[PDB]
Design a protein that fits this description.
1 chains; mainly alpha; 69% helix; RNA-binding; splicing; spliceosome
Amino acid sequence: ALIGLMTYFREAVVNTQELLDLLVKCENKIQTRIKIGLNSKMPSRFPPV
RNA sequence: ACUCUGGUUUCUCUUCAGAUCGCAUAAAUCUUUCGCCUUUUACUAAAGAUUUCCGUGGAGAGGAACAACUCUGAGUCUU
């Protein structure tokens, strides 16, 4: 989904400052979903590796 | 310048509260709008409606201190 959106617009992303917040929020939601899958209690300093 | 006029304080009970009950100020629940959002229990902060709580006034009632004289106005108040 992300590559589809970013390779469709490719220029309209930078000016849409709301889209950047939306994208990072969605990425955080996905990472939180994975972290909750790993363990019910959320981590404090989960790594990006 | 006169006779009668009956106190104040305090402890409880029962109710009504308009009023800054309160020249002070919390919490809970619910309903919406949000901010975190990841699940309640806690929350972000504005609104609306409620509940509880800390206190309050007025009135009535019942005991105690009070022990009552008299304050006091009523008046023919007097030379």
